[PDB]
């Protein structure tokens, strides 16, 4: 059928796994997916025990691709030590600035995701799974609904899938404008028909999630690895990239590069290589000033030789690379990050609520040259005081990138005082 218009984001791969089809900017339907051997991993998985599948995913070393890098197999193990029923949730809320990696899987190769969801659900004994997709991805929503119908037609969903005795339905829910609904407990609240308010953790979803039952939440990109692990086996999968951070990774690259888009690369790739070897260098061949890891971290031009992995000295996050060059005002950029957190705090926690607002409000004054001395001192204080009492990760990091700009670019901030 006809889907809404989607911009044709450039995609490029050195590994030909997650982007084997999604490197082409069009919907790949089930016949094309099947032609590439699709759903044979599911068939293989259904001839294994859930425990075996968990074991393979564990030994693959797959870590969460939604930002925190939690080991996926271990998450599944935690869930299954708890009595059922259990639920499986695919987090497709992708709303962090700079981050557009998950959508190209959803919109171009939906069956890769769906196959991943079916295998994962079987692994943890979930008979009901959800995709929670942000409201601003309407095309992705329609594409997934249609793809799920295809899978049903071919007998990959429903009751007694391929004679295995395993039953599964996948429900597609839509968000409606809140970044915080990507936080897994706020996501669950939203699926339950409520406001997206994060819950105190622990308990983690794997102990108490949707309707209080064991629930696994995993990111789109995480789930899209699962068919490869089963198809290749965990040993072959672990042979991809460095053995301590194995597997393909998607890197969404934006800002002042010549070839902005999504790159599928091993995680031993350096930030400098992502920018200059793959993304074609900078616009105008201007010097790199900074890279924003979404709205999380700010790296200076002195930090470009770090690996794009989940190590202490590595890039981390979701591998989101926003490039700023020498003429980009860092304070103007910091204001945009402050505005994001201001717009997205859910307000449950007082320092988060007032801190996200005040941080943006005072930084706007600073930027426009209308800040008093008290406003300057207040901005500094507020930036350091968003985290206290916070119950989720947003309050923990709303000041993080901005603080790093204050530390790494003092001269520029000084100009504004």
């Amino acid at each position: 059928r006809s889907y809404p218009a989607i911009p044709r984001i450039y995609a490029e791969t050195t590994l030909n796994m997650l982007l084997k089809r999604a490197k082409k900017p069009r919907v790949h339907s089930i016949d094309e997916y099947l032609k590439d051997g699709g759903y044979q991993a599911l068939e293989k998985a259904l001839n294994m025990s859930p425990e075996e599948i968990i074991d393979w995913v564990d030994k693959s070393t797959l870590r969460g691709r939604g930002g925190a890098g939690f080991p996926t197999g271990k998450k599944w193990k935690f869930a299954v030590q708890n009595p059922g029923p259990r639920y499986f949730i695919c987090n497709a809320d992708e709303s962090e600035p700079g981050t557009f990696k998950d959508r190209i899987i959803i919109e171009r190769d939906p069956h890769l995701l769906i196959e991943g969801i079916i295998i994962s659900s079987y692994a943890i004994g979930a008979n009901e799974a959800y995709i929670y997709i942000r409201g601003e991805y309407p095309a992705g929503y329609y594409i997934l609904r249609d793809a799920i119908e295809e899978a049903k037609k071919k007998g990959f969903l429903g009751k007694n899938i391929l004679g295995s005795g395993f039953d599964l339905e996948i429900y597609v829910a839509r968000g409606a404008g809140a970044y915080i609904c990507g936080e897994e407990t706020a996501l669950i609240e939203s699926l339950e028909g409520k406001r997206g308010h994060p819950r105190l953790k622990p308990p983690y979803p794997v102990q108490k999630g949707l309707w209080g039952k064991p629930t696994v939440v995993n990111n789109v990109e995480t789930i899209a690895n699962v068919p490869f692990i089963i198809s290749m086996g965990w040993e072959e999968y672990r042979y991809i990239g460095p053995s301590d951070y194995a597997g393909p990774k998607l890197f969404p690259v934006s800002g002042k590069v010549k070839k902005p888009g999504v790159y599928e690369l091993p995680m031993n790739t350096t930030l400098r290589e992502v920018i200059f070897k793959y993304a074609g260098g900078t616009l105008g061949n201007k010097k790199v000033k900074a890279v924003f890891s979404g709205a999380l971290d700010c790296f200076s031009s002195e930090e470009l030789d770090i690996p794009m992995d989940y190590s202490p000295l590595g890039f981390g996050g979701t591998g989101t690379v926003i490039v700023l060059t020498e003429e980009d005002d860092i304070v103007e950029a910091a204001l945009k990050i402050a505005e994001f957190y201001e717009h997205e705090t859910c307000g449950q926690c007082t320092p988060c609520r007032v801190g996200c607002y005040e941080q943006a409000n005072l930084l706007e004054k600073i930027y426009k040259g209308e800040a008093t001395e008290q406003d300057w001192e207040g901005f500094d204080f507020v930036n350091r005081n968003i985290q206290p009492t916070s119950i989720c990760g947003l309050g923990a990091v709303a000041g993080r990138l901005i603080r790093q700009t204050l530390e790494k670019f003092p001269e520029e901030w000084e100009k504004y005082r």
Binding site: P4, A5, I6, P7, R8, I9, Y10, E94, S95, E96, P97, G98, T99, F100, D102, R103, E128, R134, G135, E136, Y137, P138, A139, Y171, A173, R174, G175, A176, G177, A178, Y179, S190, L191, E192, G193, K194, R195, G196, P252, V253, S254, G255, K256, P260, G261, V262, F292, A295, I322, L324, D328, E332, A333, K336, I337, E339, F340, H343, E344
Partner: protein, 156 residues
């Protein structure tokens, strides 16, 4: 007395039957309502609550929480313009100026015919194609005013 036109009620009922529990369909129903009316009519919220078997104040709270929903302004087409970091870097202001030249409105406003409303939004997840906007469900990179004018001409 406020009643949903049958063709809307039908779609609402589909969503409500879709998930295992009725109340999980709340956001899909609200999307559908906004699609039909060009906004969320305050009067619609009571009947929706009844169909979801939720209290009215629960529904009101949900509409208030989620930024995609709009109870103020009826608009046939919502031009969602990303005002986040990458689009700002790559030319959000050029796009706003172009929209102002074609339509005669700024962010937050509706054209006098009720046809277009400009809605400033956070990162739309298309940052490589910055600066990014949506016209209802359709999404585009802004290239120039002449290009934008051609795009907008398709919405009648």
């Amino acid at each position: 007395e406020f009643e949903f036109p049958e063709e809307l009620k039908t779609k609402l009922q589909e969503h409500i039957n879709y998930f295992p529990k009725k109340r999980q369909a709340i956001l899909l129903c609200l999307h559908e309502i906004q699609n039909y009316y060009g906004y969320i009519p305050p009067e619609s919220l009571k009947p929706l609550a009844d169909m979801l078997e939720l209290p009215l104040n629960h529904v009101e709270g949900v509409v208030a929480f989620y930024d995609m929903f709009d109870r103020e302004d009826k608009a046939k087409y919502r031009i969602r313009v990303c005002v986040s970091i990458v689009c700002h870097l790559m030319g959000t202001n050029k796009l706003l100026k172009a929209l102002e030249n074609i339509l005669g409105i700024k962010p937050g406003e509706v054209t006098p015919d009720g046809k277009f409303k400009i809605v400033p939004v956070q990162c739309l997840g298309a940052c490589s194609e910055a600066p990014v906007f949506m016209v209802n469900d359709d999404e585009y990179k802004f290239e120039s005013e002449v290009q934008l004018n051609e795009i907008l001409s398709r919405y009648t």
